[PDB]
Symmetry: D2
Amino acid sequence: CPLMVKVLDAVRGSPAINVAVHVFRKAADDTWEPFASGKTSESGELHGLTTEEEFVEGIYKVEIDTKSYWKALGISPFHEHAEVVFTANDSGPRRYTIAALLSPYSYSTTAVVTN
Amino acid sequence: CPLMVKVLDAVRGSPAINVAVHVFRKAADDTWEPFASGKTSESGELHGLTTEEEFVEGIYKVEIDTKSYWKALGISPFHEHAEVVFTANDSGPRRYTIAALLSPYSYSTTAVVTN
Amino acid sequence: CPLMVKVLDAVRGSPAINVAVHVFRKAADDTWEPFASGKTSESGELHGLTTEEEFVEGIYKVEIDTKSYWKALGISPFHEHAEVVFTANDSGPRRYTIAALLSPYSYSTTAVVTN
Amino acid sequence: CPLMVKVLDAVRGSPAINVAVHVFRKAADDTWEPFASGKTSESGELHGLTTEEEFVEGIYKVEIDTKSYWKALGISPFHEHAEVVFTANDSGPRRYTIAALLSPYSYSTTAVVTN
């Protein structure tokens, strides 16, 4: 499991369920190419985005579609989406978990990098 | 300013106004003695809690009454309050800003300490 | 599993391992009585604090011993501990997860309440 | 002040000084056009990015160059930058403060919007 995304809802105190997540990898010409995507589960998690073979070193962007999430709950949001941009490095630990905690006008994101 | 408290509302993207704050200082007998209190202004800031003279070395607890804030807005939140516990002035006088960012089921708190 | 605690380290991007956690329940005379305690595991989680039978409605305090955590890593911290105070209510969902994200001068805490 | 950016360092408990910030605005062709840039002062604040006249309705991206900040301090962080993407001024002019709180493997961002 090279890359996992976990999302929490700070207003309801719950996993953020059915949130669209898009992962991109930066191409040689500096454009962002679609890499993987999915929707978070009932546990707020998104598994199976990629494989060890495909997840090579490079610069990745994870876009979490927070605006649509809040709108589906009838709550007025600030951001278009939450964005997490990072370099994958083979030097460090092998599993990346991108965690996000969502409020209508604020979010935090943390990388948990483990073996 | 020896001690300032600032509170923001992450649902509205606004200062958190009229938030009650109580400060305690640990006494010689290990009990929490009342030290100062007040409420946040329209800027979400609380000034004038204490003075350079009165704000001696000690262990302090800043209780931010988040439940009363949310309930006055007609919201049922998770926490009773946010509690911020820290040693102050152990290396001489510092200026402390205790900030808090509030959501119904989550909060963050940060200290900014200047010499 | 009525109550679980999960702690993350924002500096290292890792679970916060071997963090002491103390849970208290408020007594009739307003004092805090020890209720349960433990240390977080290699995954940053603390399971088995209590049982459904013992975890009755009431006001609880969870103290996460952040100062000792940072000192064991050789990093200079601000807070004595992180404190999470809440009322357990049988009305809502049945499992409480108290999550905390730690930095030397800041922390956030979120309640994830699920069935 | 139409747009202000404020950055804090959660390791030091201090303003984050000399942080580069780039603002982009989505153009008619869907590309991110450069809009304004600057760097945070000793207060961790960045003023004077734009004007009431120039800060028209649009989708804006505030890129906060967190990796360069940490590397200038001799630290290897996780993220490339923190990106804050939002529609502005769609209901008339507002004053936006975009705040960010930085840790090597985590950040939080909050918008405070006033009329």
